């Protein structure tokens, strides 16, 4: 499912990600645009053999078990077909524990191209949460 | 199915460091995020602090810097350094995964003279 | 640090009976609130977590709701095997921390 601007994040201060960490809601906005373009079932097959999954691109090799990554480390848990649902609740109890590590949300690598340094909040204003 | 055991001293002296050992059995090290807890006696719970996946350690500010966490993945175990103990370190301590799924048994630790 | 006050510290029941049990927060915390119960001699076992989300291997007699500051665990019908400590621990800022915990007894 495509979301909009404005439902995702009325969506993913719901699932609890404002301040979650410290990091504010619009940064969760921000990655998921450049990430996915705001789409549930993106995917793509990465030159490794691993696959990025769903709304926030979540990695084969170190977070999910997609059956087909070879040294894959499975961290969150879950078959990366939960992840390509129009429910957002695996992606976000993954993602929470991707940003669990010392690395946080350079974990994204478009977020952190285009949102880190950035105005995020831009990325909610104009939307009733 | 995985399984979590702490071992180390039962009875330590105040200002030694206290050392304690978490074995993992069923997964390796490396598939989670490693923690430990401590409960005192009159049931407080305290988080003291977990290892991530990059070898990133997370600390409870309440430990004043005294504790080190480190992982061995060739043994598939991770521990709990406490330096400098006092009696306020008497507790029960577990370890855990992150997630909050799987625990060890715990393990009583007394500090006295 | 975020503070977890839970209530009520001790409460008795007789089975069969329903219970809630509250965990507030000091600050906003949006979902990110466990609960674990700890029986007599026995580790901490995961019950809910993020709030309301169901474990796999938990009674269904448990369920959890709330978010943002104010956070119930209830139980619907308590059994024997319920008997023990509660706590509630959050999540979303390092330390994480626990609340005081409920004790639940047989009145």
């Known amino acids: 499912k495509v979301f909009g601007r404005c439902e995702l994040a009325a969506a993913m201060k719901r699932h609890g990600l404002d301040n979650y960490r410290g990091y504010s809601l619009g940064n969760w906005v921000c990655a998921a645009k450049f990430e996915s373009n705001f789409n549930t079932q993106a995917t793509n097959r990465n030159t490794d053999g691993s696959t990025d999954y769903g709304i926030l691109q979540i990695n084969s090799r170190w977070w999910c078990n997609d059956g087909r990554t070879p040294g894959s480390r499975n961290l969150c848990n879950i078959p990366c077909s939960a992840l390509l649902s129009s429910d957002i609740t695996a992606s976000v109890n993954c993602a929470k524990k991707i940003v669990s590590d010392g690395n946080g949300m350079n974990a994204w690598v478009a977020w952190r191209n285009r949102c880190k340094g950035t105005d995020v909040q831009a990325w909610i204003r104009g939307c009733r949460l | 199915d995985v399984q979590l055991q702490e071992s180390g001293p039962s009875l330590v002296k105040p200002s030694q460091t206290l050392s304690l050992t978490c074995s993992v059995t069923?997964?390796?090290?490396?598939?989670?995020?490693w923690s430990w807890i401590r409960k005192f006696p009159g049931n407080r719970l305290e988080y003291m602090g977990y290892?991530?996946?990059?070898?990133?350690?997370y600390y409870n500010p309440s430990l004043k810097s005294r504790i080190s966490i480190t992982r061995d993945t060739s043994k598939n175990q991770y521990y709990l350094d406490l330096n400098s103990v006092t009696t306020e370190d008497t507790a029960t301590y577990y370890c855990?995964?992150?997630?909050?799924?799987?625990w060890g048994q715990g393990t009583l630790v007394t500090v006295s003279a | 640090d975020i503070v977890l006050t839970q209530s009520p510290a001790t409460l008795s029941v007789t089975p069969g009976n329903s219970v809630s049990l509250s965990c507030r927060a000091s600050?906003?915390?949006?979902?990110?609130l466990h609960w674990y119960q700890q029986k007599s001699h026995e580790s901490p076992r995961l019950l809910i977590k993020?709030?309301?989300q169901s474990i796999s291997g938990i009674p269904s007699r448990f369920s959890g709701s709330g978010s943002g500051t104010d956070f119930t665990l209830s139980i619907n019908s308590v059994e024997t095997e319920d008997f023990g400590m509660y706590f509630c621990?959050?999540?979303?800022?390092?330390?994480?921390?626990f609340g005081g915990g409920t004790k639940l007894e047989i009145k």
């Open positions: 290892v991530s996946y990059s070898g990133s350690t």
């Open positions: 069923g997964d390796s090290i490396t598939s989670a995020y």
């Open positions: 855990a995964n992150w997630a909050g799924d799987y």
């Open positions: 993020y709030a309301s």
């Open positions: 621990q959050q999540s979303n800022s390092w330390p994480y921390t």
């Open positions: 600050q906003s915390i949006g979902n990110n």
